[PDB]
Amino acid sequence: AIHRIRITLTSRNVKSLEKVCADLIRGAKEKNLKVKGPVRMPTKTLRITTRKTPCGEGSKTWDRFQMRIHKRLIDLHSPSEIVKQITSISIEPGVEVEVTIADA
Amino acid sequence: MLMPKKNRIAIYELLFKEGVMVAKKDVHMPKHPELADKNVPNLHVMKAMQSLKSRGYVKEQFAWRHFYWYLTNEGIQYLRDYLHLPPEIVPATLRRSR
Amino acid sequence: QQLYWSHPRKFGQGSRSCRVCSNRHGLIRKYGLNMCRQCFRQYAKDIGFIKLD
Amino acid sequence: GGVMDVNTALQEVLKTALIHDGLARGIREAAKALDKRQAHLCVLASNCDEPMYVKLVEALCAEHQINLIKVDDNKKLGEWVGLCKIDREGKPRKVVGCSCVVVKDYGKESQAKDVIEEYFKCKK
Amino acid sequence: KKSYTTPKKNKHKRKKVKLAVLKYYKVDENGKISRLRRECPSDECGAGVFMASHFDRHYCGKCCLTYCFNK
Amino acid sequence: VEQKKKRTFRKFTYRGVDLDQLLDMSYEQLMQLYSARQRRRLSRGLRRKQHSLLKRLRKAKKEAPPMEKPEVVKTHLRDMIILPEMVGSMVGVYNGKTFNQVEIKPEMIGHYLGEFSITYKPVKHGR
RNA sequence: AGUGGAGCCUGCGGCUUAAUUUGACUCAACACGGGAAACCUCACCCGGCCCGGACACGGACAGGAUUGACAGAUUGAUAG
């Protein structure tokens, strides 16, 4: 039977995330699994605020760094192992990809 | 610190066999990583290693308030005699060669 | 002949410090960083934090 | 194996036992070790200051396996166990006695261990 | 500088005179050890240990802090 | 020099419990009644690891006759809340640089030692 | 729109304090040191423990170098 599988992809790097996502989608359908297509989730902006000045005299100067984590999921439905197998191969560095047994 | 030369030999043997030994630095700590001499702040493990170090035999790298002991060639020879175990027993380095 | 040399701390800023030095005031505990701000400035490149705004 | 000499046969066992941690040196440790079955040798001095020391040792030996072999000079007995390097003009812990000592656990096979054990059995 | 200095003598190390240590029991001929002082029955006791006489407290220093006659 | 009807004339309740009843209850039964600051200290503390200090109080109260006050018993703590057991003692209450000596009378019960010792001048500028 | 005027808050000066740790002095010092500090912290001040005197060399010295501790003395601490 078909099994509902959720592929979560998490990263911070648009271009890398995007062309990993590409490869998963394209290779999925190529030897037949569900296509779906990406559910983009809101990018989360982690904001850290610090004093720019060690030892505070002068003027109030503040520095704010952000780090933008990006999340997307894709729900494929098709059979068990050959899903998570054909997907998770052909990638090694720098974009997290999680294949989850979640969803019935 | 203080403590017998039964604790000291235990530490030295573990350094010899692994080829690494580690401690961490805090005075509010209770307990160094890699077994230690067990719920105590910075001391016994560090001091046994420090004594060993003074006479050569181990190279210490410090960074991010942690002590990485890296076993030296001369140290492999010294501990081999001190432990008095057969004259090759393989100290966990030389292993695979590139 | 130690009898006491620690005392329980889990209270205020005095119970934690930077993970490369000992420091107080402005200790980032958010995201499990556990570094003082002054140190964090020099390592802000290495965590992945970046300024654009 | 081997058959060695009788006096050097003791010394090697004393040295091994020290590193193992199992050489009872001086009266308090020697007596405690003797009165327990961990002991399997007792080498006494008989050149002790105030031989009440030796009398107490011999008395202790009677219970919990009797082991007796006598050797001469306190200082030599001390040195044999190891408390000096036998090097340099000084040593910081240099040559001093320990008098009567008791060996708990030989801790090695063959050699001097085998010699002393064999000698002890056919002696007693 | 704060406050803090102290005299010492060995205010900082222990020696307890020079110690008597183990010189007690009574021996008659070869070989027996006949009780002197008091003896302490515990499992953390040795086998030639004593209770220091110090009368109306009688405490085995081989025991950790415990095991005391007050007789 | 100890207990009620003696160094008191303000009397009545401290806080809900009359000094008569107070002095002949134990601290157990005291914290049950009308006591909120004291109650938090005793509950969370749980007999409060000031053990030896408290024993020195009882010791010098005992060895001195009940007709007179103790030989004075110092403490470094000043966060100690006066409990009826203590009362009639004479307590050296540390200020981090001075021990002010304060007899604990029946009017002081439920108050803190620290409030009867000073770290602070009446404040002057040449006044 | 106020601010300066008022109350309080917070930093700063001066005094006072055994201690009021301390950097800074038009701007380019001054609710500024992400500094909203109970003690703890803590630098300051009032006291006390410990050696983390490693290592090498010398001496002492296993007849006991050193470790622990009852009760009593003590002391903030039945902290041997």
PDB file of C-alpha atoms in Angstrom, chain D residues 1-122:
ATOM      1  CA  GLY D   1      60.965 -21.723  37.276  1.00  0.00           C
ATOM      2  CA  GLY D   2      64.578 -21.287  38.359  1.00  0.00           C
ATOM      3  CA  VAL D   3      66.048 -21.706  41.815  1.00  0.00           C
ATOM      4  CA  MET D   4      67.916 -18.369  42.070  1.00  0.00           C
ATOM      5  CA  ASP D   5      69.305 -17.611  45.494  1.00  0.00           C
ATOM      6  CA  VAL D   6      67.070 -17.473  48.552  1.00  0.00           C
ATOM      7  CA  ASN D   7      67.608 -13.834  49.492  1.00  0.00           C
ATOM      8  CA  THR D   8      67.222 -12.270  46.023  1.00  0.00           C
ATOM      9  CA  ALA D   9      64.099 -14.462  45.571  1.00  0.00           C
ATOM     10  CA  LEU D  10      62.391 -12.329  48.227  1.00  0.00           C
ATOM     11  CA  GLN D  11      63.425  -8.948  46.770  1.00  0.00           C
ATOM     12  CA  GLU D  12      61.778  -9.322  43.347  1.00  0.00           C
ATOM     13  CA  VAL D  13      58.434 -10.230  44.943  1.00  0.00           C
ATOM     14  CA  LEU D  14      58.707  -7.208  47.297  1.00  0.00           C
ATOM     15  CA  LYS D  15      59.266  -4.874  44.312  1.00  0.00           C
ATOM     16  CA  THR D  16      56.334  -6.263  42.270  1.00  0.00           C
ATOM     17  CA  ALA D  17      53.985  -6.150  45.281  1.00  0.00           C
ATOM     18  CA  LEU D  18      54.783  -2.438  45.830  1.00  0.00           C
ATOM     19  CA  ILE D  19      53.762  -1.445  42.270  1.00  0.00           C
ATOM     20  CA  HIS D  20      50.663  -3.679  42.432  1.00  0.00           C
ATOM     21  CA  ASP D  21      49.846  -2.010  45.777  1.00  0.00           C
ATOM     22  CA  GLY D  22      49.872  -4.921  48.141  1.00  0.00           C
ATOM     23  CA  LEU D  23      53.166  -4.587  49.994  1.00  0.00           C
ATOM     24  CA  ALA D  24      52.433  -3.954  53.650  1.00  0.00           C
ATOM     25  CA  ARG D  25      55.356  -1.885  54.931  1.00  0.00           C
ATOM     26  CA  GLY D  26      56.005  -1.134  58.594  1.00  0.00           C
ATOM     27  CA  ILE D  27      54.272  -2.426  61.718  1.00  0.00           C
ATOM     28  CA  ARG D  28      50.690  -1.144  61.337  1.00  0.00           C
ATOM     29  CA  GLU D  29      50.169  -2.254  57.732  1.00  0.00           C
ATOM     30  CA  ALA D  30      52.241  -5.422  58.213  1.00  0.00           C
ATOM     31  CA  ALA D  31      50.214  -6.552  61.227  1.00  0.00           C
ATOM     32  CA  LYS D  32      46.824  -5.882  59.610  1.00  0.00           C
ATOM     33  CA  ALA D  33      47.873  -7.759  56.443  1.00  0.00           C
ATOM     34  CA  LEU D  34      49.310 -10.632  58.504  1.00  0.00           C
ATOM     35  CA  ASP D  35      46.098 -11.146  60.504  1.00  0.00           C
ATOM     36  CA  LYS D  36      44.231 -11.698  57.236  1.00  0.00           C
ATOM     37  CA  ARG D  37      44.665 -14.464  54.713  1.00  0.00           C
ATOM     38  CA  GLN D  38      45.851 -12.109  51.953  1.00  0.00           C
ATOM     39  CA  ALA D  39      49.374 -12.630  53.337  1.00  0.00           C
ATOM     40  CA  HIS D  40      51.414 -15.468  51.864  1.00  0.00           C
ATOM     41  CA  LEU D  41      54.864 -14.408  53.004  1.00  0.00           C
ATOM     42  CA  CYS D  42      56.286 -12.554  55.969  1.00  0.00           C
ATOM     43  CA  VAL D  43      59.931 -11.556  55.804  1.00  0.00           C
ATOM     44  CA  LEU D  44      61.132 -10.295  59.149  1.00  0.00           C
ATOM     45  CA  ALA D  45      64.111  -8.282  60.280  1.00  0.00           C
ATOM     46  CA  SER D  46      65.937  -9.340  63.433  1.00  0.00           C
ATOM     47  CA  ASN D  47      68.297  -6.377  63.716  1.00  0.00           C
ATOM     48  CA  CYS D  48      65.391  -4.186  64.887  1.00  0.00           C
ATOM     49  CA  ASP D  49      65.833  -1.610  67.614  1.00  0.00           C
ATOM     50  CA  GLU D  50      63.998  -3.074  70.619  1.00  0.00           C
ATOM     51  CA  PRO D  51      63.215  -6.666  69.382  1.00  0.00           C
ATOM     52  CA  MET D  52      59.686  -6.419  70.941  1.00  0.00           C
ATOM     53  CA  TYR D  53      58.936  -5.333  67.360  1.00  0.00           C
ATOM     54  CA  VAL D  54      60.057  -8.744  66.030  1.00  0.00           C
ATOM     55  CA  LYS D  55      58.303 -10.565  68.917  1.00  0.00           C
ATOM     56  CA  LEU D  56      54.977  -8.904  68.017  1.00  0.00           C
ATOM     57  CA  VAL D  57      55.440  -9.840  64.327  1.00  0.00           C
ATOM     58  CA  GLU D  58      56.204 -13.512  65.141  1.00  0.00           C
ATOM     59  CA  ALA D  59      53.180 -13.625  67.490  1.00  0.00           C
ATOM     60  CA  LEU D  60      50.956 -12.243  64.717  1.00  0.00           C
ATOM     61  CA  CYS D  61      52.375 -14.836  62.261  1.00  0.00           C
ATOM     62  CA  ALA D  62      51.102 -17.739  64.415  1.00  0.00           C
ATOM     63  CA  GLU D  63      47.489 -16.993  63.522  1.00  0.00           C
ATOM     64  CA  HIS D  64      46.375 -16.684  59.877  1.00  0.00           C
ATOM     65  CA  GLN D  65      49.167 -18.749  58.257  1.00  0.00           C
ATOM     66  CA  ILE D  66      52.592 -18.881  59.890  1.00  0.00           C
ATOM     67  CA  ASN D  67      55.245 -17.494  57.591  1.00  0.00           C
ATOM     68  CA  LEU D  68      58.757 -16.955  58.876  1.00  0.00           C
ATOM     69  CA  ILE D  69      62.005 -16.285  57.097  1.00  0.00           C
ATOM     70  CA  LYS D  70      64.594 -13.997  58.648  1.00  0.00           C
ATOM     71  CA  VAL D  71      66.965 -11.605  56.921  1.00  0.00           C
ATOM     72  CA  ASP D  72      69.430  -9.142  58.376  1.00  0.00           C
ATOM     73  CA  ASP D  73      69.447  -5.353  58.654  1.00  0.00           C
ATOM     74  CA  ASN D  74      66.287  -3.220  58.737  1.00  0.00           C
ATOM     75  CA  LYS D  75      67.633  -0.774  56.160  1.00  0.00           C
ATOM     76  CA  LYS D  76      68.232  -3.477  53.537  1.00  0.00           C
ATOM     77  CA  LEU D  77      64.656  -4.725  53.951  1.00  0.00           C
ATOM     78  CA  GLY D  78      63.397  -1.153  53.392  1.00  0.00           C
ATOM     79  CA  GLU D  79      65.572  -0.687  50.289  1.00  0.00           C
ATOM     80  CA  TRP D  80      64.451  -4.013  48.742  1.00  0.00           C
ATOM     81  CA  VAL D  81      60.790  -2.908  48.785  1.00  0.00           C
ATOM     82  CA  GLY D  82      61.823   0.394  47.193  1.00  0.00           C
ATOM     83  CA  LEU D  83      61.977   3.841  48.722  1.00  0.00           C
ATOM     84  CA  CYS D  84      65.117   4.990  46.930  1.00  0.00           C
ATOM     85  CA  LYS D  85      66.447   4.899  43.383  1.00  0.00           C
ATOM     86  CA  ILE D  86      69.929   3.682  44.393  1.00  0.00           C
ATOM     87  CA  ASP D  87      71.236   6.576  42.291  1.00  0.00           C
ATOM     88  CA  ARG D  88      72.806   9.955  43.108  1.00  0.00           C
ATOM     89  CA  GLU D  89      74.488  11.277  46.274  1.00  0.00           C
ATOM     90  CA  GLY D  90      71.121  11.992  47.875  1.00  0.00           C
ATOM     91  CA  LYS D  91      67.633  10.890  47.265  1.00  0.00           C
ATOM     92  CA  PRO D  92      64.764  12.836  48.927  1.00  0.00           C
ATOM     93  CA  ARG D  93      63.330   9.625  50.436  1.00  0.00           C
ATOM     94  CA  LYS D  94      66.768   7.949  50.734  1.00  0.00           C
ATOM     95  CA  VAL D  95      67.669   4.648  52.463  1.00  0.00           C
ATOM     96  CA  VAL D  96      65.759   4.057  55.670  1.00  0.00           C
ATOM     97  CA  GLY D  97      64.228   0.862  57.045  1.00  0.00           C
ATOM     98  CA  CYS D  98      60.738  -0.526  57.029  1.00  0.00           C
ATOM     99  CA  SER D  99      61.841  -3.577  59.073  1.00  0.00           C
ATOM    100  CA  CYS D 100      59.365  -6.492  58.967  1.00  0.00           C
ATOM    101  CA  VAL D 101      57.084  -6.458  55.916  1.00  0.00           C
ATOM    102  CA  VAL D 102      54.338  -8.776  54.728  1.00  0.00           C
ATOM    103  CA  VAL D 103      53.462  -9.585  51.136  1.00  0.00           C
ATOM    104  CA  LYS D 104      49.836  -9.740  50.147  1.00  0.00           C
ATOM    105  CA  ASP D 105      49.518 -11.297  46.682  1.00  0.00           C
ATOM    106  CA  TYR D 106      52.611 -12.116  44.607  1.00  0.00           C
ATOM    107  CA  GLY D 107      50.727 -10.878  41.550  1.00  0.00           C
ATOM    108  CA  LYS D 108      52.947 -12.556  38.950  1.00  0.00           C
ATOM    109  CA  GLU D 109      53.589 -16.126  37.857  1.00  0.00           C
ATOM    110  CA  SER D 110      56.939 -17.965  37.691  1.00  0.00           C
ATOM    111  CA  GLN D 111      60.481 -16.834  38.625  1.00  0.00           C
ATOM    112  CA  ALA D 112      61.132 -15.552  42.174  1.00  0.00           C
ATOM    113  CA  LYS D 113      57.465 -16.029  43.131  1.00  0.00           C
ATOM    114  CA  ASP D 114      57.670 -19.747  42.265  1.00  0.00           C
ATOM    115  CA  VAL D 115      61.043 -20.027  44.113  1.00  0.00           C
ATOM    116  CA  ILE D 116      59.829 -18.532  47.438  1.00  0.00           C
ATOM    117  CA  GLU D 117      56.540 -20.496  47.417  1.00  0.00           C
ATOM    118  CA  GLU D 118      58.286 -23.835  46.764  1.00  0.00           C
ATOM    119  CA  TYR D 119      60.932 -23.089  49.405  1.00  0.00           C
ATOM    120  CA  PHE D 120      58.221 -22.157  51.960  1.00  0.00           C
ATOM    121  CA  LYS D 121      56.151 -25.322  51.440  1.00  0.00           C
ATOM    122  CA  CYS D 122      58.963 -27.847  51.882  1.00  0.00           C
TER     123      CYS D 122
END
